[PDB]
Amino acid sequence: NCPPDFSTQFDREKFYKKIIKTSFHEDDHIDLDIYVPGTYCFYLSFKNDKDELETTRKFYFVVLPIL
Amino acid sequence: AHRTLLLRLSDSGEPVTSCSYGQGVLTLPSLPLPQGKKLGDMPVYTVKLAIPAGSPVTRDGLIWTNCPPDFSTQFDREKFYKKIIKTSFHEDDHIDLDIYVPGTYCFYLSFKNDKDELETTRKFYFVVLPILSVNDKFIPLNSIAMQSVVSKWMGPTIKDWEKVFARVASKKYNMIHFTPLQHRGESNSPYSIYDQLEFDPTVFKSEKEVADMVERLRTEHNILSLTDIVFNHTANNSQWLLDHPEAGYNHKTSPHLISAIELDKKLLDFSEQMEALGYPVDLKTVDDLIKVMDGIKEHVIGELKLWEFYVVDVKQTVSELREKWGNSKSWSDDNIPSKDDSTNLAQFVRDNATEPGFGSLGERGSNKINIDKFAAILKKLHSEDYNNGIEELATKILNDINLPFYKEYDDDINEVLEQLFNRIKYLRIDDHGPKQGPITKKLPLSEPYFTRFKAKDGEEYALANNGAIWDGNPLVDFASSQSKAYLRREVIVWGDCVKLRYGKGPSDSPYLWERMSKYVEMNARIFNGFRIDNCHSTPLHVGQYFLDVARRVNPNLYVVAELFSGSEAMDCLFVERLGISSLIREAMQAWSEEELSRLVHRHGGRPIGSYKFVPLDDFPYPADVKIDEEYCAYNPDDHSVKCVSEIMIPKTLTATPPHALFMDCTHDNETPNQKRTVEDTLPNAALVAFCSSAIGSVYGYDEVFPQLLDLVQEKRTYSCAENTGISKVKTLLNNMREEIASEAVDIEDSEMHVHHDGQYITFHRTNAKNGKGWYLVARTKFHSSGDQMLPRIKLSQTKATFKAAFSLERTGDAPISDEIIEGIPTKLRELTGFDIGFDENTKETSILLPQDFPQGSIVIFETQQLGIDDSLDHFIRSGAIKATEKLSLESINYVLYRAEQEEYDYSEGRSGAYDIPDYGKPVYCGLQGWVSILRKIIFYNDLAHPLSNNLRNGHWAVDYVVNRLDLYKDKEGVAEVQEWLRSRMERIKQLPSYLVPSFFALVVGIMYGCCRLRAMQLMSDNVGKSTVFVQSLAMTSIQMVSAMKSTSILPDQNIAAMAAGLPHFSTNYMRCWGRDVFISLRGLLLTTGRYEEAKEHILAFAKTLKHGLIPNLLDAGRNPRYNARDAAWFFVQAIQDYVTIVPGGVSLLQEKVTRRFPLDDEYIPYDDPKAFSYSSTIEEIIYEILNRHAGGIKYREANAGPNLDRVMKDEGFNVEVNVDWETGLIHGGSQFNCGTWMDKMGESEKANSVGVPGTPRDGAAVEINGLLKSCLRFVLQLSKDGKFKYTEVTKPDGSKISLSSWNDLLQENFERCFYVPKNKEDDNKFEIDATIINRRGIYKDLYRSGKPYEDYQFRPNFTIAMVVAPELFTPDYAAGAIELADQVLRGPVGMRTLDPSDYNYRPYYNNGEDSDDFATSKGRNYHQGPEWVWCYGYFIRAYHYFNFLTNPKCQVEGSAKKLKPSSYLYRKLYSRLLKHREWIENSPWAGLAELTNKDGEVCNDSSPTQAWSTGCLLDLFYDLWISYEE
């Protein structure tokens, strides 16, 4: 739910797509640019071994305010 | 290249028939592989499955199929593979099935039921035919010439056979059918095979010896080979039957035949000592007949123990009743009937006290009573002491139990001996084929029903021998327990053979399945195919397994079968599952000349001039589709299946009748010399060879053998006499079919006409592609019936050429040799005298036969239809895409549609629609009017339809299609579309008349599809990628948007104007209606992408502003009568939709118009400086409506009087509109004014309603106020973005009201005024007078209305506010209210305009009824019951929205946790649109009606296609697309 830029406001339930570059050798790194302090979470969706859709927990991280 | 076939599926997963070819099988056309490609380089075919979008199968749907995923994977009947159906509510899903090897394949679908359970459809089969080549030349399946030869009559050496091979090669047969070349049994019959695993030791010794001979036939004489394969029986003297006696039905495996065994050996024991008494041994007398039955009466029948097989042993049960009288001796139940009902008590014991298997045949005492359960009933019914009359009671019951068994015995015995003295008679006395040989050891009186033998396992068995019941069902195994044929002696047996007992699988007979498997694959390595005798008697699962084993060995296995099941449906099912490639048909079965003409008619082809299939208005036209620009992306070496036109919609896969192998004479039917005469051998084989199918003949038919050869006894050898009888003609017939086979392909490519006059039979074979053809006149010789003269033969638009003619004459009888089979000497005299007259004016060919044309003669003509060359199909199937290149969404309207009133506008009333004789006129003047009629004609090949008759009677309809476009020639792309029609229709008129209908429908269908494809390309993606139903709804946009001459939307020029409906709302002042245009603007123009056209209508109506309102009737720019209180608010809603949808649509507000009216409410200055005067941006036009309404409006209609509404009263013209500023609701109207969409001014003087509105909606209408709230919300956010520069609105006294406050006033007071609470407790808050009420849980239809009851009337107008202003509704109140409308107000296609439970409810509308009824007379019912279709759109749009917010079952966790509707909600939405999809499918007008009577009843006064009826359904599809399909 991290907004893509500072112009976009924060919405708790509007999540944005990010593509995981699959490889059998190389790990993939995906950046999450944060422009404003607040509460942000992330979860992952993938193709199950049953060829179904599956989702992990929501994992949160806090950016403290600047005083 | 492109070997893909399209198989469309229905909503239940069943394949759809594209044409009506009859009861058939999904067969794929046999074609050779591409140039230099083997099996595995690429898929042989690809079946594109088309599943409808939103169908009940798509719900968690999976496609199952046993098709292997690649060539490496072998084929398994029961291993199915998964395929995922991509569910969508808009787009159909296509799933390919790549097939690499011919065989039998099936598919079924699994989906989630409406009960959330799993459900499965039928298995649907389709056959891929094998590819038959000899060396490297492909042999089409319908050009097969089969010569059946019997092994034991060809000589004892291989070279003695190769002499026969050279003889049949000269006759130019390309295939040889072999009776099984295996070691034969005792009787030496070819079908009683001694050993299946080795060939005849007389000729062959190993597989390599016979495999080289078959390969020698391939390389030497260019001849393929196949054999008979016998599954049903084996020889009665096999050394493996001694080891494995369980392979057949014996007393162990099938115990029910024990009764028949003891009866069969009761005759081998009886006939051996028969003549000892032998009163009539072998005589031909009636006295002799009855004496045999009296020897049977006492010596076998009375010596078989009265047959205890059925009857319970009476006294041996009483003996075993006092015996166990002491065990279980109590029956606690009370159900036991008393001795009063002596029959119900008899069968009650049968249900409770019986050992298993009661009431069936088995051992001698098969039926028995459970003792301890019987005596327990006797003690409960009579007494616990035995001597208390139990011996009498128990015997009385058992005698009554055996009464049906005794009558089952008397009916069996009578059939045993009646069958006996009927067959023994025919063997001796009956002179229809006798042989009264004295009863010897070889021929007893009883044909042996059981082959008894001493087994090698230390036992003795009695295996029977199969046969056939006289007229019984062959699908029933007469050896199984279900039949009593072996007992009742209803079997015609073959002592040569012996049972083969297959079970449910290999588990019931292990060695039999393993032996037959190795026997099948042995011949599969050698030969090209199989032949199955009496395939209908072989069980399915047995035939399925072994034919698949053979196809794994020989992938190109060609299967023929003598299949005569119960019906054609069963024949197709056997062909479906077994993979049979051809069915045997016999020409000798025809008893007379008419039966032969009907048999030849069945397998000859399709009628001459048959219609050709084309994609029409029932197919999807994806804008993103590949196209063949000039039908040129084809190469003959690729051998690809062709698409129908330039559009690349692949060739459809439809059920076709199973292929036939027409045999002029098999090896089982009598000779033409026997059944008819010898002269008939020539015309019979000619009529068969002319059929468009596979043909065959038995050896000796061409060599005119005298009589049918006895397959059992005869040992003589075929003659080496060459070129006898028809051998010269069969060389000609087979060579001619070789020339035709090069180009004839599918079922539509070969046509036929057959005529029968007395003893003559006419056959006309025609190729539909080039026009080449053959004409056969065959005089049959069934009997010497005298001289008969055939009338003059006339061929229209055809030239004829003499090919050949022959006569067959008999020169005495046949020689009588004892070592060689010699035929009858026959003369083959060539005939002359055939006069072929050709009229160079009428282009008609006349043929006169010569008087020297005896019976048993033929004459073949080469014919050619005039005007047809090989290049005709290419010229018609090309150029149409390029011709439609410059078409626009406006110009397509003139090419496809145009009602007769619309055509009268451009032609000043001279043209109109073409009038078909004995039928009527097409619904549209364009191509759609033809396609709506032709689709059913092409599907049924109705050449007798009045349109089909008119098309071949003259070229009027042909020239009418081209001459119409002169009215619209100057329009974009119409000139080039006309020229393509002109050049193609000109080429068509040069054809024979009888071919014009088929080619007329082909040209119209091609140009129609190209125009419909061009429309989808010009529209948006949501439409250009969706189902046929969505695209069919989208084509309504083109039906309505047209430029006219008598009207428009602008007074200056005549441009495109959306009509209200066709045909009654299309010309003059009746076309454009402000309320009707802007309700359908979002659906027909915004959803489709007609943005620039949607702007023109908004600007054109923006100039016609007056009284702060949009006129109901727009006269372009002249007198627009302002009898509307609804139009301006639908107009402001369309403006919001334009800005919301059109990219950069906010610019619409700043578009400047020229107001053709003063700012005040004055008069009509059409010719004045006030026409131009001042401009007006849309921004101030919107504010002018909001402020004029709030500031109060009051006006009397201008020019009121007879000049205007000729029924409206004086007070009705005075309309005033006001806003109640305590609620914000806009009231207005009167009981004499009809300013809403329910406009119906009474006009009945017989009912006294002239000027009385049927549905006056005075006060606050939910539709008006809902759009007001939607407009306030729209302008508020618009001011937040700096787009709307107005923020205050003055009230009548003078105070200024903030727009947000007016927006909040409705938010605080709308639901309070209209909602009717379900609970009587909350009536003190929602302003309700409970005395005048109907249903609770209802949103009011009117507020402060004249009629107090019309306020609380259930009408479908509240859904309009629910769609445009959902913020005014609490979710639970709205969901429950719209659920009531679904149950009460929702019709099948239209929405009921009034609650059926109301007293004013009259749902039938007839505008012209003259009565004293205040409702039915003169159409006053318009909106008081009748079902309107557009209200259905707003209903389901809000039904989808509020069920998605309220019901938790209508939501599912979607992408990015954004909640999307569940498949449970999609299912409920899809079901409520089925009646709409049926309507537009089966309607001549390609749209949805305006109105419908009660419960789907068609209303004749209703306009058959309405703009806003379809536009409101397109609004729903846009809602689901723009919010979820991302």
Ligand SMILES: OC[C@H]1O[C@H](O[C@H]2[C@H](O)[C@@H](O)[C@@H](O[C@H]3[C@H](O)[C@@H](O)[C@@H](O[C@H]4[C@H](O)[C@@H](O)[C@@H](O[C@H]5[C@H](O)[C@@H](O)[C@@H](O)O[C@@H]5CO)O[C@@H]4CO)O[C@@H]3CO)O[C@@H]2CO)[C@H](O)[C@@H](O)[C@@H]1O
């Ligand atoms: O100079 C042009 C025109 O000017 C004047 O027009 C007026 C009409 O004469 C006058 O009767 C009135 O027409 C209204 C009508 O009052 C109003 O109630 C409504 O009527 C319904 C019909 O009752 C209904 O049956 C249906 O009409 C269909 C019909 O069902 C169908 O089967 C088929 O026959 O086509 C008919 C339509 O052509 O629906 C209509 C509504 O669509 O609406 C009528 C049209 O507004 O008011 C007109 C305007 O003042 C002159 O009087 C007239 O002679 C001139 O030709």
Ligand SMILES: OC[C@H]1O[C@H](O[C@H]2[C@H](O)[C@@H](O)[C@@H](O)O[C@@H]2CO)[C@H](O)[C@@H](O)[C@@H]1O
């Ligand atoms: O539209 C032209 C018109 O042509 C034909 O009418 C012919 C025909 O012979 C008969 O209908 C006759 O009564 O009038 C005309 C004499 O040539 C079509 O039959 C007719 O349907 C068609 O409309």
Ligand SMILES: OC[C@H]1O[C@H](O[C@H]2[C@H](O)[C@@H](O)[C@@H](O)O[C@@H]2CO)[C@H](O)[C@@H](O)[C@@H]1O
């Ligand atoms: O006593 C209540 C009454 O309600 C229903 O009658 C309706 C009528 O059908 C409508 O036309 C309405 O406008 O007047 C009544 C208001 O309820 C029932 O049909 C009726 O039996 C019942 O008596």
